[PDB]
Amino acid sequence: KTISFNFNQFHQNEEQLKLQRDARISSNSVLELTKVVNGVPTWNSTGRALYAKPVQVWDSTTGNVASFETRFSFSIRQPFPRPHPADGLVFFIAPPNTQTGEGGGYFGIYNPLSPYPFVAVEFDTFRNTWDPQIPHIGIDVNSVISTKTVPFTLDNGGIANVVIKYDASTKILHVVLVFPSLGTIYTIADIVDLKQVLPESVNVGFSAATGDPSGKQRNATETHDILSWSFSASLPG
Amino acid sequence: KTISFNFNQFHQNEEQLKLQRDARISSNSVLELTKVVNGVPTWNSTGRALYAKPVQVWDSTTGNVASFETRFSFSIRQPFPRPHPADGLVFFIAPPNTQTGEGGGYFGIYNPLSPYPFVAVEFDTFRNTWDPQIPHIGIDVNSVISTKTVPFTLDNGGIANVVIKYDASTKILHVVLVFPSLGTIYTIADIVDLKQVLPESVNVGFSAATGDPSGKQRNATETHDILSWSFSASLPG
Ligand SMILES: *[C@@H]1O[C@H](CO)[C@@H](O[C@@H]2O[C@H](CO)[C@@H](O)[C@H](O)[C@H]2NC(C)=O)[C@H](O[C@H]2O[C@@H](C)[C@@H](O)[C@@H](O)[C@@H]2O)[C@H]1NC(C)=O
Ligand SMILES: *[C@@H]1O[C@H](CO)[C@@H](O[C@H]2O[C@H](CO)[C@@H](O)[C@H](O)[C@H]2NC(C)=O)[C@H](O[C@@H]2O[C@@H](C)[C@@H](O)[C@@H](O)[C@@H]2O)[C@H]1NC(C)=O
Ligand SMILES: *[C@@H]1O[C@H](CO)[C@@H](O[C@@H]2O[C@H](CO)[C@@H](O)[C@H](O)[C@H]2NC(C)=O)[C@H](O)[C@H]1NC(C)=O
Ligand SMILES: *[C@@H]1O[C@H](CO)[C@@H](O[C@H]2O[C@H](CO)[C@@H](O)[C@H](O)[C@H]2NC(C)=O)[C@H](O)[C@H]1NC(C)=O
Ligand SMILES: CO[C@H]1O[C@H](CO)[C@H](O)[C@H](O)[C@H]1O
Ligand SMILES: CO[C@H]1O[C@H](CO)[C@H](O)[C@H](O)[C@H]1O
Ligand SMILES: [Ca+2]
Ligand SMILES: [Ca+2]
Ligand SMILES: [Mn+2]
Ligand SMILES: [Mn+2]
């Protein structure tokens, strides 16, 4: 069974999407993950957007795991370079029917009290204690401390194209980040065994966060906009 | 140990490179692996360019294999589309002090009567027996029949940016191909154990070939230009 969907833009009130927390779809058809009040992003914001139907990434009966490819474009504008922008966005895969975890360096996907499994690709802008220099792309499994990391220079408010491909045969998760206007390319790959970590059915989506209050910097912020999104998955069983 | 070099453009008789067969460096600072007379690519051509010094991909004493990243831009101009362009170019790693193999579908890296091992990434423009639809990026290990292959649409005469990266820890070889003018991105990856196929020291370079006489089509040709090239490898021990 193969599943696919694509959004060249988001129409206000998408019946195909589950917006959670601060996530909204602006009038101009862009999906805003964290709050932006009148052209200016706010600190203390956290939002998620999941595809509304669970996609089966593996089947017990056959043991077969799916291969998938997801491509999307996003933009992160950092108005205030002054103290430190934060926190970044992630494309994640988690069990179905979850809720926004902790904000700040957890991007809304990790809940310190009751942790649930998840595979995520992160585009990190704030250097937390467990973090290497930022910004960096990172591969997260059940945690926010990336198994693999690679730094990237941001195209401030520019467009970024992302290709995340997973080969079930090689168990390789490869992500590419291209900033078309700069012409810069960044790649990162790691071996991930979805069958070990996540359940048969999952929800795929994005989560982003702005600076946490307990950091005190009201300028610990930026936008986390996603312009388009496509995903395709093939379970041979 | 760490080794790295960068070619922003090639100069005539670059001491750092070793040209072989038809390969030459034009006055315009471009590396033409295969012959092109008066702006027209010729058939029956093969050329190689290797970096003058050997690099160490692993050490037997410690058993440490090197991680590396290489980036280059190429341009393939297919003037006569009618018959069928041939054959392509490859980035390849081989034992030191080798000689140009068989042109045509072997790109000049394979010699059927005295085979040497190699790890190469190809950009295949002509479909041989052992081939799937072309053009395609393919990961070749000791053979021209790829282990992994991904189809891609060429930007005829246009520029392509390639990023090849190998992580020793995961043994992942991930390659990215981006056509800037076209805004296209293609990604392919595969687990390759350099240690299991190559010697401690190697040569890195490119190789290209136009249509072989044994095909009669004198139009089985295209250019195989290399605009720039940067390389970096790191061996812990
Ligand atoms: C950052 O955002 C949250 C959510 O907007 C603020 O709190 C309020 O949050 C609680 C949920 O824990 C909710 O029940 C309240 O209705 C909500 N109220 C308002 C007016 O925002 C959070 O902080 C603040 O904490 C609450 C308890 C309230 O005292 C408010 O005045 C205070 O600012 C925000 N923190 C900062 C520092 O902006
Ligand atoms: C090899 O390349 C030639 C140039 O691209 C092709 O020929 C010509 O192209 C078109 C027809 O496809 C004509 O409008 C041009 O006037 C031709 N130009 C020249 C310089 O030859 C050629 O295609 C073929 O050869 C031409 C001359 C005709 O006889 C066609 O029947 C034939 O397809 C191409 N070679 C081959 C073997 O396809
Ligand atoms: C294809 O290419 C080869 C190399 O350019 C041609 O061959 C050569 O001709 C000279 C002069 O006789 C010899 O010294 C070379 O050593 C030859 N090379 C080989 C491999 O035989 C070859 O004839 C060309 N074929 C066609 C049809 O143009
Ligand atoms: C947070 O960012 C602001 C805005 O960039 C910083 O404040 C000021 O910024 C410029 C340089 O400091 C001034 O020229 C601006 O006029 C002024 N902006 C405003 C709205 O007053 C501020 O210093 C930063 N805060 C911290 C803690 O670094
Ligand atoms: C000091 O850290 C805390 O606040 C900053 C804001 O300055 C970041 O949000 C970070 O995620 C959070 O842990
Ligand atoms: C017919 O096959 C032979 O000629 C064609 C050109 O037409 C290619 O060069 C191919 O690699 C070679 O083996
Ligand atoms: Ca962080
Ligand atoms: Ca071929
Ligand atoms: Mn991180
Ligand atoms: Mn091939």
UniProtKB/Swiss-Prot annotation, chains A, B:
Keywords: Glycoprotein, Lectin. The keyword Glycoprotein applies. PROSITE patterns: LECTIN_LEGUME_BETA. SUPFAM superfamilies: Concanavalin A-like lectins/glucanases (SSF49899). InterPro entries: ConA-like_dom_sf, L-lectin, Lectin_legB_Mn/Ca_BS, Legume_lectin_dom, Leguminous_Lectin. Glycans are attached at residues 44, 219. One of its GO terms (molecular function) is carbohydrate binding. Belongs to the leguminous lectin family. Lectin. This is Basic agglutinin. It comes from Psophocarpus tetragonolobus.
